[PDB]
Design a protein around this nucleic acid. Structure first.
Ligand SMILES: [Mg+2]
Ligand SMILES: [Mg+2]
Ligand SMILES: [Mg+2]
Ligand SMILES: [Mg+2]
Ligand SMILES: [Mg+2]
Ligand SMILES: [Mg+2]
Ligand SMILES: [Mg+2]
Ligand SMILES: [Mg+2]
Ligand SMILES: [Mg+2]
Ligand SMILES: [Mg+2]
Ligand SMILES: [Mg+2]
Ligand SMILES: [Mg+2]
Ligand SMILES: [Mg+2]
Ligand SMILES: [Mg+2]
Ligand SMILES: [Mg+2]
Ligand SMILES: [Mg+2]
Ligand SMILES: [Mg+2]
Ligand SMILES: [Mg+2]
Ligand SMILES: [Mg+2]
Ligand SMILES: [Mg+2]
Ligand SMILES: [Mg+2]
Ligand SMILES: [Mg+2]
Ligand SMILES: [Mg+2]
Ligand SMILES: [Mg+2]
Ligand SMILES: [Mg+2]
Ligand SMILES: [Mg+2]
Ligand SMILES: [Mg+2]
Ligand SMILES: [Mg+2]
Ligand SMILES: [Mg+2]
Ligand SMILES: [Mg+2]
Ligand SMILES: [Mg+2]
Ligand SMILES: [Mg+2]
Ligand SMILES: [Mg+2]
Ligand SMILES: [Mg+2]
Ligand SMILES: [Mg+2]
Ligand SMILES: [Mg+2]
Ligand SMILES: [Mg+2]
Ligand SMILES: [Mg+2]
Ligand SMILES: [Mg+2]
Ligand SMILES: [Mg+2]
Ligand SMILES: [Mg+2]
Ligand SMILES: [Mg+2]
Ligand SMILES: [Mg+2]
Ligand SMILES: [Mg+2]
Ligand SMILES: [Mg+2]
Ligand SMILES: [Mg+2]
Ligand SMILES: [Mg+2]
Ligand SMILES: [Mg+2]
Ligand SMILES: [Mg+2]
Ligand SMILES: [Mg+2]
Ligand SMILES: [Mg+2]
Ligand SMILES: [Mg+2]
Ligand SMILES: [Mg+2]
Ligand SMILES: [Mg+2]
Ligand SMILES: [Mg+2]
Ligand SMILES: [Mg+2]
Ligand SMILES: [Mg+2]
Ligand SMILES: [Mg+2]
Ligand SMILES: [Mg+2]
Ligand SMILES: [Mg+2]
Ligand SMILES: [Mg+2]
Ligand SMILES: [Mg+2]
Ligand SMILES: [Mg+2]
Ligand SMILES: [Mg+2]
Ligand SMILES: [Mg+2]
Ligand SMILES: [Mg+2]
Ligand SMILES: [Mg+2]
Ligand SMILES: [Mg+2]
Ligand SMILES: [Mg+2]
Ligand SMILES: [Mg+2]
Ligand SMILES: [Mg+2]
Ligand SMILES: [Mg+2]
Ligand SMILES: [Mg+2]
Ligand SMILES: [Mg+2]
Ligand SMILES: [Mg+2]
Ligand SMILES: [Mg+2]
Ligand SMILES: [Mg+2]
Ligand SMILES: [Mg+2]
Ligand SMILES: [Mg+2]
Ligand SMILES: [Mg+2]
Ligand SMILES: [Mg+2]
Ligand SMILES: [Mg+2]
Ligand SMILES: [Mg+2]
Ligand SMILES: [Mg+2]
Ligand SMILES: [Mg+2]
Ligand SMILES: [Mg+2]
Ligand SMILES: [Mg+2]
Ligand SMILES: [Mg+2]
Ligand SMILES: [Mg+2]
Ligand SMILES: [Mg+2]
Ligand SMILES: [Mg+2]
Ligand SMILES: [Mg+2]
Ligand SMILES: [Mg+2]
Ligand SMILES: [Mg+2]
Ligand SMILES: [Mg+2]
Ligand SMILES: [Mg+2]
Ligand SMILES: [Mg+2]
Ligand SMILES: [Mg+2]
Ligand SMILES: [Mg+2]
Ligand SMILES: [Mg+2]
Ligand SMILES: [Mg+2]
Ligand SMILES: [Mg+2]
Ligand SMILES: [Mg+2]
Ligand SMILES: [Mg+2]
Ligand SMILES: [Mg+2]
Ligand SMILES: [Mg+2]
Ligand SMILES: [Mg+2]
Ligand SMILES: [Mg+2]
Ligand SMILES: [Mg+2]
Ligand SMILES: [Mg+2]
Ligand SMILES: [Mg+2]
Ligand SMILES: [Mg+2]
Ligand SMILES: [Mg+2]
Ligand SMILES: [Mg+2]
Ligand SMILES: [Mg+2]
Ligand SMILES: [Mg+2]
Ligand SMILES: [Mg+2]
Ligand SMILES: [Mg+2]
Ligand SMILES: [Mg+2]
Ligand SMILES: [Mg+2]
Ligand SMILES: [Mg+2]
Ligand SMILES: [Mg+2]
Ligand SMILES: [Mg+2]
Ligand SMILES: [Mg+2]
Ligand SMILES: [Mg+2]
Ligand SMILES: [Mg+2]
Ligand SMILES: [Mg+2]
Ligand SMILES: [Mg+2]
Ligand SMILES: [Mg+2]
Ligand SMILES: [Mg+2]
Ligand SMILES: [Mg+2]
Ligand SMILES: [Mg+2]
Ligand SMILES: [Mg+2]
Ligand SMILES: [Mg+2]
Ligand SMILES: [Mg+2]
Ligand SMILES: [Mg+2]
Ligand SMILES: [Mg+2]
Ligand SMILES: [Mg+2]
Ligand SMILES: [Mg+2]
Ligand SMILES: [Mg+2]
Ligand SMILES: [Mg+2]
Ligand SMILES: [Mg+2]
Ligand SMILES: [Mg+2]
Ligand SMILES: [Mg+2]
Ligand SMILES: [Mg+2]
Ligand SMILES: [Mg+2]
Ligand SMILES: [Mg+2]
Ligand SMILES: [Mg+2]
Ligand SMILES: [Mg+2]
Ligand SMILES: [Mg+2]
Ligand SMILES: [Mg+2]
Ligand SMILES: [Mg+2]
Ligand SMILES: [Mg+2]
Ligand SMILES: [Mg+2]
Ligand SMILES: [Mg+2]
Ligand SMILES: [Mg+2]
Ligand SMILES: [Mg+2]
Ligand SMILES: [Mg+2]
Ligand SMILES: [Mg+2]
Ligand SMILES: [Mg+2]
Ligand SMILES: [Mg+2]
Ligand SMILES: [Mg+2]
Ligand SMILES: [Mg+2]
Ligand SMILES: [Mg+2]
Ligand SMILES: [Mg+2]
Ligand SMILES: [Mg+2]
Ligand SMILES: [Mg+2]
Ligand SMILES: [Mg+2]
Ligand SMILES: [Mg+2]
Ligand SMILES: [Mg+2]
Ligand SMILES: [Mg+2]
Ligand SMILES: [Mg+2]
Ligand SMILES: [Mg+2]
Ligand SMILES: [Mg+2]
Ligand SMILES: [Mg+2]
Ligand SMILES: [Mg+2]
Ligand SMILES: [Mg+2]
Ligand SMILES: [Mg+2]
Ligand SMILES: [Mg+2]
Ligand SMILES: [Mg+2]
Ligand SMILES: [Mg+2]
Ligand SMILES: [Mg+2]
Ligand SMILES: [Mg+2]
Ligand SMILES: [Mg+2]
Ligand SMILES: [Mg+2]
Ligand SMILES: [Mg+2]
Ligand SMILES: [Mg+2]
Ligand SMILES: [Mg+2]
Ligand SMILES: [Mg+2]
Ligand SMILES: [Mg+2]
Ligand SMILES: [Mg+2]
Ligand SMILES: [Mg+2]
Ligand SMILES: [Mg+2]
Ligand SMILES: [Mg+2]
Ligand SMILES: [Mg+2]
Ligand SMILES: [Mg+2]
Ligand SMILES: [Mg+2]
Ligand SMILES: [Mg+2]
Ligand SMILES: [Mg+2]
Ligand SMILES: [Mg+2]
Ligand SMILES: [Mg+2]
Ligand SMILES: [Mg+2]
Ligand SMILES: [Mg+2]
Ligand SMILES: [Mg+2]
Ligand SMILES: [Mg+2]
Ligand SMILES: [Mg+2]
Ligand SMILES: [Mg+2]
Ligand SMILES: [Mg+2]
Ligand SMILES: [Mg+2]
Ligand SMILES: [Mg+2]
Ligand SMILES: [Mg+2]
Ligand SMILES: [Mg+2]
Ligand SMILES: [Mg+2]
Ligand SMILES: [Mg+2]
Ligand SMILES: [Mg+2]
Ligand SMILES: [Mg+2]
Ligand SMILES: [Mg+2]
Ligand SMILES: [Mg+2]
Ligand SMILES: [Mg+2]
Ligand SMILES: [Mg+2]
Ligand SMILES: [Mg+2]
Ligand SMILES: [Mg+2]
Ligand SMILES: [Mg+2]
Ligand SMILES: [Mg+2]
Ligand SMILES: [Mg+2]
Ligand SMILES: [Mg+2]
Ligand SMILES: [Mg+2]
Ligand SMILES: [Mg+2]
Ligand SMILES: [Mg+2]
Ligand SMILES: [Mg+2]
Ligand SMILES: [Mg+2]
Ligand SMILES: [Mg+2]
Ligand SMILES: [Mg+2]
Ligand SMILES: [Mg+2]
Ligand SMILES: [Mg+2]
Ligand SMILES: [Mg+2]
Ligand SMILES: [Mg+2]
Ligand SMILES: [Mg+2]
Ligand SMILES: [Mg+2]
Ligand SMILES: [Mg+2]
Ligand SMILES: [Mg+2]
Ligand SMILES: [Mg+2]
Ligand SMILES: [Mg+2]
Ligand SMILES: [Mg+2]
Ligand SMILES: [Mg+2]
Ligand SMILES: [Mg+2]
Ligand SMILES: [Mg+2]
Ligand SMILES: [Mg+2]
Ligand SMILES: [Mg+2]
Ligand SMILES: [Mg+2]
Ligand SMILES: [Mg+2]
Ligand SMILES: [Mg+2]
Lengths: 76, 134, 76
RNA sequence: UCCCCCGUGCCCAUAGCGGCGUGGAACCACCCGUUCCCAUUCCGAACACGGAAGUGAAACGCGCCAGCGCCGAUGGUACUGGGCGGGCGACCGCCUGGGAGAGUAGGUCGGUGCGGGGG
RNA sequence: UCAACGGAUAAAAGUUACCCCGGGGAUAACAGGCUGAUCUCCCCCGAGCGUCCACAGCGGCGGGGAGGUUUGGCACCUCGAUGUCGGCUCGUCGCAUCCUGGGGCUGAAGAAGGUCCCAAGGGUUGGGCUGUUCGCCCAUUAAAGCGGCACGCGAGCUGGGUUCAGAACGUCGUGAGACAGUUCGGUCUCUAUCCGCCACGGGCGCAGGAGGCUUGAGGGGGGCUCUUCCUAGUACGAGAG
RNA sequence: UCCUAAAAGGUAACGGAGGCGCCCAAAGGUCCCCUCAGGCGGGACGGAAAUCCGCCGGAGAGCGCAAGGGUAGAAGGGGGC
RNA sequence: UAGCGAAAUUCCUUGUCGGGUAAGUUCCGACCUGCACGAAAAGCGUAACGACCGGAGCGCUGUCUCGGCGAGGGACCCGGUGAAAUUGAACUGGCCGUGAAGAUGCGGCCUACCCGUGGCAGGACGAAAAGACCCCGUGGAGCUUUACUGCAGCCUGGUGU
RNA sequence: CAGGCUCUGGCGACUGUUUACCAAAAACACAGCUCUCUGCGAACUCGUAAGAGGAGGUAUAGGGAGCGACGCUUGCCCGG
RNA sequence: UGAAAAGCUAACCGAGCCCGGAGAUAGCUGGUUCUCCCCGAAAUGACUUUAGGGUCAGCCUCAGGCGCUGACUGGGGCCUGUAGAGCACUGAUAGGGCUAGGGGGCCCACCAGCCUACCAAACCCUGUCAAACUCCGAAGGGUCCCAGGUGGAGCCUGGGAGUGAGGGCGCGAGCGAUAACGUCCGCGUCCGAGCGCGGGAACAACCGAGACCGCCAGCUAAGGCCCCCAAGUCUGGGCUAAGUGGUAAAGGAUGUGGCGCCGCGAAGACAGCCAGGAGGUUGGCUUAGAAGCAGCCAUCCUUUAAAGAGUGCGUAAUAGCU
RNA sequence: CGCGGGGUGGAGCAGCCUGGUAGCUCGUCGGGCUCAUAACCCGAAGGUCGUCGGUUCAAAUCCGGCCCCCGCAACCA
RNA sequence: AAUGUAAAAA
RNA sequence: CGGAUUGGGGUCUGCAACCCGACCCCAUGAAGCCGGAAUCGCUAGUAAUCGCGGAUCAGCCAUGCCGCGGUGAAUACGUU
RNA sequence: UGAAACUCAAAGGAAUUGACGGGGGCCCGCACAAGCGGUGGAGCAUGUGGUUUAAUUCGAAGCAACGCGAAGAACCUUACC
C-alpha cells in the first residue's frame, strides 16, 4: 500500500533570537521563502537564509503590510 | 459529496462546540452524550418521524455525516482499512441539536421526536424553544 | 417483474460449520472451516470446504446457492 | 510661534472604498507644440524636450459623511501549566495561576518627523 | 537503475517429504489467556402483517447487551516436547429445557397444537452411508436437547483420517521437486514414587479393664416413562373427534 | 513535498496523500520598461474561451515540472547589451 | 482425432439417472460443462495369475446385542537371590480467587488422627528425547538447471615427432 | 496332520524383485515393440598410462533410451 | 554393488571406519569459584546482506585540569501555529431567498412566451463540518541576558565499561473496532536494578515510602479502628430496605426521600358514588359495508347547569356499556 | 484478500508504448446481374472508445478510483 | 459457376 | 452555356382556375463541365437530327400518342 | 447362413411421344461481333412501388405491368372520401 514515503526533516527556523550577541556573519534565520526580510547589516543568500554582516545584537521588527524584518544593531 | 479519502479518528473531548440551540421549528432533539452517529442511524430516525405523522409538517436535520468510517475485512495489519463499511458519520457531542420538527402539535413532536430517540445510540432530550435566542 | 434477492433472507436458510476434510495437518483437525448452506424452503443445498477460511467459504457457498436457487425460480 | 501648498520618511486601514463640497495668487496637474535631446513591438497614450495661451474638467491637496471595509472593550464562558477526586468506559468534576475566538458596547473617514516655497 | 541507492566479488539461480547442527516460546501451527469484530442467545423502539386489532402469533429502519460453543485478532506461560480428528470406555457439570412434572396467555369448544414463565430429578433407542465431526436417510420413541470440562478422556484403548521415508493419477515447474487435490502402504513405550480415587489392614487414641447390643450428627444410593381398561362414548362438538 | 508531529528542533507504524533520477545559451548576469487572474459592457469573422476598447478588479494569475513557503514596493511579462 | 471419461485423473460433488439395500458420501451401469483423460512418461481392451486395493451375497461364528463359566502361565502370600529409568530438597489435601495469564507450596475458605497392602490411571503442565513442525544463523549437507566460475571429456587451428 | 465358497470393479499380463530393522505394492524386473550409436585397434565403460572389459564377439552383433505378455491402434504441429 | 529403496557396503550410510589438519569455525546455548567499601547504567539515534551481531553518538565510572557555570527558579526580551474557536482562503454542508442551465405540461411553429407543491451552477441570509482548511489564537514550550542556586551539580582532556529485546501506569495522537495484559511515537513516571518495608485479601510497576547496623522507645504516611486483626460498636445531621453496599447497558416503573413551577378547592375540589350523557348527525368522502367509532377531509348550532362533528370496547353494519 | 492482462460502429479484431487524424473483415442500407433468391459487382451509412474524476491548450491514447471479462496464485503446519 | 417447398389434368 | 426555382404584374377558356389550367412580360437566374456497376435502339433514305399536322378536347398540365415531310451517316472480318 | 415388427400402393422392365442437356451436326433473327447515337448522373415532365391521408377509387406485374385502360381528372369526368 504505497504511502510509506517522506523526506528527511530540514530543521529550519530562527537560529538566533532577539537580544543575542552575534559574530561576524553567523546565520540568524533559515526560512522557506521570505517569512522574514533583511535589514541593517543583514543580507540573505540563495535559500533565503539570513545572516549577520557585522557583530552586535539581533533585533526583530514587524512592519505590517511591509513584512517582518531582522537586523543587527552593532557596537564596538 | 467530495472531500478527500479516509480521515483519522480523533477524540471527542468535552461537548464545547458539541451543541447549539433550536434554529428552526417548534421543537427539537438534543444529544446528552458524545458519539459518532452513522448515516443509517440518521435516516432511521428521519423516516421514522415521517412515518409517524403521514403527510406531515417539516423535519429539519441540523447534523450531517462527513467523517469516513474505516474498517478491516476480517484480516490483520497491512495498510489502513479500506473503510467506509458503515460509510459515514457525524460527530455529535453533548448539547448538539440534531432534528427540528415544525408544523405539528406537541403530542406529535413529543411522540415522533421520542421515537427517533430510540434509533439513536445516545441518551437524548426534546426541547420546546424556551426563548433564549441572540 | 422479478424476485431474486428476497430469498437470501437469513431466516430461510441454515448454515452449518464443521471440520474440513483431507489435508491441513493439525490445522484441518482442530479448525472447522467446512461450510454448508442449506436452503430450507427448497431443501437445495451447497457445501464448500476449498479455502482455509470459514468466512471465505460461507461467502462462496452463499454465492453459489444464490445462482442455483435463482435458476430454479427462473425456471418456475 | 501660526497657516497654505511642495518634496521626503515614519506608525502601516481608526489611514481604505464610495458620497458631497472645495482651491489655481504661489505650488501641482492638465494644456500648446514635437524643431532639437529622446521615445512607441503602432500611437509624443507613455517616457522625453521646448513652451505662452487656456483650465481646476481629470489627477491631486483639503474637508464633511459611516453605507461597505478596517479597528473593537467589558463581563462571561472554552481551553489550559501546576495540584486533587470520579465513571467499565466514551468521559466528567474541584483547587491554584494563566485565559481566548466569536458576538456585544463602542471607535474610524487618520497621526506624525524632517526639509523647501508661499502670507 | 553499485536503484537492496553508506555501494560485500571483477564475476552467481532453484530444490529437499532423504535431510542434518546450533538456537528461539525473542516467532507460526495445538491448547490456555486477553479481546469478542464473527458466532450463539436475549433485549429497547415499534413502520407494518395478522378481516377489526402494533406482542394470540409476528416485526422493516435503527439501537443496547449477555455468553465465551465457532471463525478471527494479539503473541503472554509452554519449542532441554503441553501428542493432534474421529470412534471406544468411563463419565461429570451448565441450563439458554428435547421428554416427563407445574403454570399465564391463545386467533384454547373438545382432542391436538402455538407461545412465554417455573422447573435438572431422572430419562434422552437401533441401523444404512462416510475416517469422519456434521449431515441425509430407514424403523421406532415420552423424547430421540444443546453445551462446559486442554472442542473432557491415547502413563486407558483404537489408529480409519491427519503429519515422515515408498508408489501412482491429475497438476505446476526445463529441472530437482511441488499441491488444506486425489490414491494404495506404512513400528502408539511390561514395573505408579507423590496427589487423587477404589478397596483392605497395622498403630495409637476415645483420662478404670472387659463381652454384647444400639443412637444417628454427617454422608452416600435412588429418583425415568409409556399403553390399554373403567369412569364415558359422559362434559364438549353440526359432525368427524 | 504535506500531514500525522502534541505552536522551538526532533520524533514511529506494511499511518494518510503526491512527486524526483530532469530541464533552460536562454528558462542565465545586468540596465531600462512593464503588471495578472478573473467579472460586467461594447465589438466584423470568432465565439463559453482567439484579437480589440471601456470600466471594476491586491493578488484567487504567473513563477519549466509535485507540493509547500514566498511573492506584482517582483521572484512575474518585454527589450538592449 | 480414435478411443475413454465424476476415473488410482471431478473443485462445485453425496453432480443427475438407473442397480443393489429397510435405508448406499462407498460400490456397480449410464450420460459428459473432462476445474485439470488422450494415444510407447503409450490409448483403449484382455483369458489367466495376485498373502495388491474396492463393492456385494451364501456359509459360519463370542466381531457384536452382552456377557457368563472354566483351564493352565503370571499377578497375591512364604522361603532364597535381587535390578531400572527417575530424583533441587519435602513435613507433597479440596474449592474459589490468585499469580508469567492451567497452584500441594500465595489469599481466603472447606476437609483431614499416624503408617502401610492390594488395585485405578485424573493431576504432579508425569519419564524418555537440549521439538523432527515453524522461524532465526550472512550453520551444514544431498539434488537440479538455459544461476556464477572452474575441471574431465570431446571438437579445433598452429606447430614438434 | 487337513481349502470357507460365489458374484462384480480397479492396477499390474504372467513365475520373479525390493526399502536387512515401521512400506512387498499398482513400485523395479520380465519376454516383447520402437528409436539411436557402432565397420572393428567398434561404439561405449574403468584406468594418468600400460592396459582391460566389450569379445577371442563382428550389424540376425554390441552399447544407450523409452515403452513393457497378447489384441486393436498410436492423429496433427518442426516457430523455440 | 544395486530386478532401483538413495537400498547395502561390519547393529544409525543423501556418501563407511580409523587417524591426522584439530584447540576448524560457532555474530548460538551453557558455565565462570573468597570478603568488604564508594558510585552506578541501557534497552534510544545514525549507518549496517543490518535486525537476538556490530561502529559512532547518548547514558555509567575512575584520574588529572577548570572554578559558580548545573539542574530547578525570579525578571525581561525575541521565535511558535497546537487546545480552543473561526469560515476570510481550499473543500464539505442542511433549509430558505434569489437566479443561469436542465426536466415536464398549456401554447407553437417564424422563433417566442407563460406556468412549474421538479434538478440545479453562481450569488445572498439561516445553520454547520474539516489531520493534510485558517481572518484568529491561548495555557505552555524553546533560546539569549541578568540574578538565586556549592550540588555524588556543571565544563575540559584522558583510562575503563556495560547497553543497543524493554515493561506497566497517567496524559497527548496514529494504527485497531472510541477491542486486546494489542500495537507505534511523544512527555512523564515506577518495575527493570527497589519480587526490600506498610496499604490494596493474595499480586514487578495502583496509593504510602527510598532498608548502613542495633533497641521488648517514640510521631506519623497510605490505609484503617465489629470479631479473625492494632486501634471508636466515637459524636452530630441526613439517605438507603436492595444484602443495594459486595462492583453491566439501552430502555423501563403510583420504590422512597428532598427542592421547584403550574393549575383545582370551604362560592365545596381529587376519589368513589346516584341521574342525563341528547337533537339535524346516520358529519362530508370512499368502501360490498364504513351509523362518534377501517382508511381520507375536516373546526356547526340547538334543549341545557350538561353531553366532544368524538375515548375505548363491541356488531356484518347497530344498539349497547363507557 | 494478491498479482497480470482487457472493456473500441450490430459481431470479432486493430489504434494506445511514442496524446492532434478511430482503421480491417463480416454484417447493415441503396442500386445492379437473375425468372427469382445466394454468390458476384457499384455506392453509402454506423462508433458516448465501461462509468466517475484528474493532467494537458488538447485524452480512446497519460494518471487515480469504482464496475464487468479473462490468466495466475491462495503454501508449512 | 448453388438452390427454388407445400392443392391444377371428364 | 443551361433555363430550374422564386417574386411581381397581366391576358384567355370556362358558372369557377386556393387546392389544380395554359400563356405573356419583367426580375430572379438552380443542379448540371457528358454521368458507377449496369443497359436500350438502329443495317439505308435507316440512326441521328429538324420542324408540320391530326385524333381527343371549353381550356389543358402533350415532353404523350398516331401520322408527315426536310437535311442525312457509320459499319457488318465472322458465327467461337 | 439370414429373419421380424413396422410401413408404402406401389416398386419395376422394355418401348413411345415430348421437354430439357454446362451433347452433337446443319441453319437463322440488330442475337453477338463491327458501328452510330443513347438511358443509368443533373433539372423537369410522366407512369409505378412505398409511406402518408378523412379519402389519396380500381385494374395492369419479368420478357408480353410501369407516357399501359385514360385519344385530354379544376366542378363534368369519377368508380374514392
Ligand atoms: Mg513513514
Ligand atoms: Mg518533511
Ligand atoms: Mg521520518
Ligand atoms: Mg515531515
Ligand atoms: Mg460504530
Ligand atoms: Mg496471521
Ligand atoms: Mg407554527
Ligand atoms: Mg405549536
Ligand atoms: Mg435508542
Ligand atoms: Mg438511546
Ligand atoms: Mg429522553
Ligand atoms: Mg443563544
Ligand atoms: Mg429477514
Ligand atoms: Mg480424507
Ligand atoms: Mg498431501
Ligand atoms: Mg503437504
Ligand atoms: Mg484454530
Ligand atoms: Mg477452534
Ligand atoms: Mg480443502
Ligand atoms: Mg484453495
Ligand atoms: Mg414452487
Ligand atoms: Mg518664533
Ligand atoms: Mg523658535
Ligand atoms: Mg523616521
Ligand atoms: Mg483657475
Ligand atoms: Mg489644438
Ligand atoms: Mg514628426
Ligand atoms: Mg519647425
Ligand atoms: Mg541639436
Ligand atoms: Mg533645445
Ligand atoms: Mg531615453
Ligand atoms: Mg518604433
Ligand atoms: Mg526646443
Ligand atoms: Mg478656478
Ligand atoms: Mg477636481
Ligand atoms: Mg481626492
Ligand atoms: Mg471583537
Ligand atoms: Mg474578555
Ligand atoms: Mg486547571
Ligand atoms: Mg491540569
Ligand atoms: Mg489543588
Ligand atoms: Mg476507575
Ligand atoms: Mg475577543
Ligand atoms: Mg458578526
Ligand atoms: Mg473612513
Ligand atoms: Mg477618503
Ligand atoms: Mg516646516
Ligand atoms: Mg544494502
Ligand atoms: Mg546488489
Ligand atoms: Mg525445502
Ligand atoms: Mg517427495
Ligand atoms: Mg514420496
Ligand atoms: Mg525418493
Ligand atoms: Mg543428509
Ligand atoms: Mg535440531
Ligand atoms: Mg510468545
Ligand atoms: Mg458480548
Ligand atoms: Mg450477533
Ligand atoms: Mg438481554
Ligand atoms: Mg419504532
Ligand atoms: Mg405507538
Ligand atoms: Mg391491516
Ligand atoms: Mg420497511
Ligand atoms: Mg431485518
Ligand atoms: Mg447495532
Ligand atoms: Mg450492538
Ligand atoms: Mg509485543
Ligand atoms: Mg523439562
Ligand atoms: Mg514431559
Ligand atoms: Mg414441560
Ligand atoms: Mg386443550
Ligand atoms: Mg477418504
Ligand atoms: Mg440415533
Ligand atoms: Mg477450541
Ligand atoms: Mg474452547
Ligand atoms: Mg479432544
Ligand atoms: Mg497411544
Ligand atoms: Mg487419539
Ligand atoms: Mg481420542
Ligand atoms: Mg496399522
Ligand atoms: Mg482410508
Ligand atoms: Mg494412516
Ligand atoms: Mg524418513
Ligand atoms: Mg511438463
Ligand atoms: Mg487446491
Ligand atoms: Mg489411504
Ligand atoms: Mg499391507
Ligand atoms: Mg506383560
Ligand atoms: Mg500400570
Ligand atoms: Mg501389628
Ligand atoms: Mg485401624
Ligand atoms: Mg442423616
Ligand atoms: Mg443422590
Ligand atoms: Mg367408551
Ligand atoms: Mg359420539
Ligand atoms: Mg363402552
Ligand atoms: Mg353435549
Ligand atoms: Mg361425518
Ligand atoms: Mg370416535
Ligand atoms: Mg514539513
Ligand atoms: Mg513541530
Ligand atoms: Mg508541520
Ligand atoms: Mg503540550
Ligand atoms: Mg512540543
Ligand atoms: Mg492533534
Ligand atoms: Mg511546528
Ligand atoms: Mg493515519
Ligand atoms: Mg544519470
Ligand atoms: Mg537570449
Ligand atoms: Mg459594465
Ligand atoms: Mg457582437
Ligand atoms: Mg471569442
Ligand atoms: Mg464577445
Ligand atoms: Mg498573496
Ligand atoms: Mg509546513
Ligand atoms: Mg506555490
Ligand atoms: Mg502557494
Ligand atoms: Mg524581472
Ligand atoms: Mg473425441
Ligand atoms: Mg458418482
Ligand atoms: Mg482406472
Ligand atoms: Mg450420491
Ligand atoms: Mg436406489
Ligand atoms: Mg468449476
Ligand atoms: Mg486435455
Ligand atoms: Mg508421449
Ligand atoms: Mg501403461
Ligand atoms: Mg482385466
Ligand atoms: Mg501380491
Ligand atoms: Mg507373487
Ligand atoms: Mg454357495
Ligand atoms: Mg454372511
Ligand atoms: Mg487361573
Ligand atoms: Mg492369591
Ligand atoms: Mg509381590
Ligand atoms: Mg496423604
Ligand atoms: Mg501434593
Ligand atoms: Mg504471602
Ligand atoms: Mg498403594
Ligand atoms: Mg509385598
Ligand atoms: Mg495418574
Ligand atoms: Mg505431587
Ligand atoms: Mg498425563
Ligand atoms: Mg532446541
Ligand atoms: Mg547471504
Ligand atoms: Mg553444499
Ligand atoms: Mg545456451
Ligand atoms: Mg540450450
Ligand atoms: Mg573452459
Ligand atoms: Mg590441439
Ligand atoms: Mg591439433
Ligand atoms: Mg488331511
Ligand atoms: Mg487342502
Ligand atoms: Mg462351499
Ligand atoms: Mg505383478
Ligand atoms: Mg495393460
Ligand atoms: Mg515359483
Ligand atoms: Mg537381488
Ligand atoms: Mg524384505
Ligand atoms: Mg536400520
Ligand atoms: Mg531403514
Ligand atoms: Mg508379495
Ligand atoms: Mg522396487
Ligand atoms: Mg529387452
Ligand atoms: Mg508388443
Ligand atoms: Mg549406422
Ligand atoms: Mg569416467
Ligand atoms: Mg579417461
Ligand atoms: Mg575375449
Ligand atoms: Mg504421438
Ligand atoms: Mg487433428
Ligand atoms: Mg517443432
Ligand atoms: Mg527446421
Ligand atoms: Mg527453423
Ligand atoms: Mg539390501
Ligand atoms: Mg567397524
Ligand atoms: Mg539400529
Ligand atoms: Mg547403506
Ligand atoms: Mg558428505
Ligand atoms: Mg572445539
Ligand atoms: Mg561478532
Ligand atoms: Mg548509591
Ligand atoms: Mg540491533
Ligand atoms: Mg570562585
Ligand atoms: Mg525565565
Ligand atoms: Mg469557508
Ligand atoms: Mg450552501
Ligand atoms: Mg428554464
Ligand atoms: Mg424549461
Ligand atoms: Mg400546461
Ligand atoms: Mg423552467
Ligand atoms: Mg445581496
Ligand atoms: Mg450568511
Ligand atoms: Mg449576514
Ligand atoms: Mg495565521
Ligand atoms: Mg472577523
Ligand atoms: Mg482578532
Ligand atoms: Mg547565575
Ligand atoms: Mg530497539
Ligand atoms: Mg518502548
Ligand atoms: Mg490498551
Ligand atoms: Mg511482595
Ligand atoms: Mg488484584
Ligand atoms: Mg520488582
Ligand atoms: Mg510491588
Ligand atoms: Mg501515637
Ligand atoms: Mg489517617
Ligand atoms: Mg452517625
Ligand atoms: Mg447518622
Ligand atoms: Mg451484591
Ligand atoms: Mg425512567
Ligand atoms: Mg407520575
Ligand atoms: Mg350519542
Ligand atoms: Mg349516515
Ligand atoms: Mg349513536
Ligand atoms: Mg366499526
Ligand atoms: Mg347482540
Ligand atoms: Mg352494512
Ligand atoms: Mg352510540
Ligand atoms: Mg483488445
Ligand atoms: Mg482497465
Ligand atoms: Mg474485455
Ligand atoms: Mg479502446
Ligand atoms: Mg464490441
Ligand atoms: Mg453496442
Ligand atoms: Mg489499453
Ligand atoms: Mg423480386
Ligand atoms: Mg451515387
Ligand atoms: Mg462496398
Ligand atoms: Mg478509456
Ligand atoms: Mg480524439
Ligand atoms: Mg491454483
Ligand atoms: Mg512440514
Ligand atoms: Mg515446503
Ligand atoms: Mg439449400
Ligand atoms: Mg426448401
Ligand atoms: Mg420441387
Ligand atoms: Mg398591368
Ligand atoms: Mg465550359
Ligand atoms: Mg387540343
Ligand atoms: Mg408531338
Ligand atoms: Mg425382434
Ligand atoms: Mg438489339
Ligand atoms: Mg431488321
Ligand atoms: Mg455491339
Ligand atoms: Mg445518361
Ligand atoms: Mg435522371
Ligand atoms: Mg416500377
Ligand atoms: Mg402523418
Ligand atoms: Mg376490379
Ligand atoms: Mg392500384
Ligand atoms: Mg392520359
Amino acid at each position: 500500500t504505497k504511502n510509506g514515503r517522506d523526506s528527511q526533516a530540514k530543521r529550519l527556523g530562527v537560529k538566533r533570537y532577539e537580544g543575542q550577541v552575534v559574530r561576524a556573519g553567523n546565520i540568524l534565520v533559515r526560512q522557506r521563502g521570505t517569512r522574514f526580510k533583511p535589514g541593517k547589516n543583514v543580507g540573505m543568500g540563495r535559500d533565503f537564509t539570513l545572516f549577520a554582516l557585522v557583530d552586535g545584537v539581533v533585533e526583530f521588527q514587524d512592519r505590517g503590510r511591509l513584512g517582518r524584518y531582522v537586523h543587527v544593531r552593532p557596537l564596538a | 459529496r467530495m472531500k478527500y479519502r479516509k480521515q483519522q479518528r480523533g477524540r471527542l473531548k468535552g461537548a464545547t462546540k458539541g451543541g447549539d440551540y433550536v434554529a428552526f421549528g417548534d421543537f427539537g432533539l438534543v444529544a446528552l452524550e458524545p458519539a459518532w452517529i452513522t448515516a443509517q442511524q440518521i435516516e432511521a430516525a428521519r423516516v421514522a418521524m415521517v412515518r409517524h405523522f403521514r403527510r406531515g409538517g417539516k423535519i429539519f436535520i441540523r447534523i450531517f455525516p462527513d467523517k469516513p468510517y474505516t474498517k478491516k475485512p476480517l484480516e490483520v495489519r497491512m495498510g489502513k482499512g479500506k473503510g467506509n463499511v458503515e460509510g459515514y458519520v457525524a460527530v455529535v457531542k453533548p448539547g448538539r441539536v440534531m432534528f427540528e420538527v415544525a408544523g405539528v402539535t406537541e403530542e406529535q413532536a413529543m411522540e415522533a421526536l421520542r421515537i427517533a430517540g430510540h434509533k439513536l445510540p445516545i441518551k437524548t432530550k426534546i426541547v420546546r424553544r424556551d426563548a433564549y435566542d441572540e | 417483474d422479478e424476485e431474486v434477492e428476497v430469498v437470501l433472507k437469513p431466516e430461510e436458510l441454515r448454515i452449518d460449520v464443521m471440520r474440513a476434510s483431507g489435508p491441513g495437518g493439525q490445522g484441518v483437525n482442530t479448525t472447522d472451516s467446512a461450510v454448508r448452506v442449506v436452503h430450507l424452503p427448497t431443501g437445495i443445498t451447497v457445501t464448500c470446504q476449498t479455502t482455509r477460511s470459514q468466512i471465505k467459504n460461507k461467502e462462496l457457498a452463499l454465492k453459489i446457492l444464490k445462482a442455483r436457487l435463482y435458476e430454479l425460480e427462473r425456471k418456475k
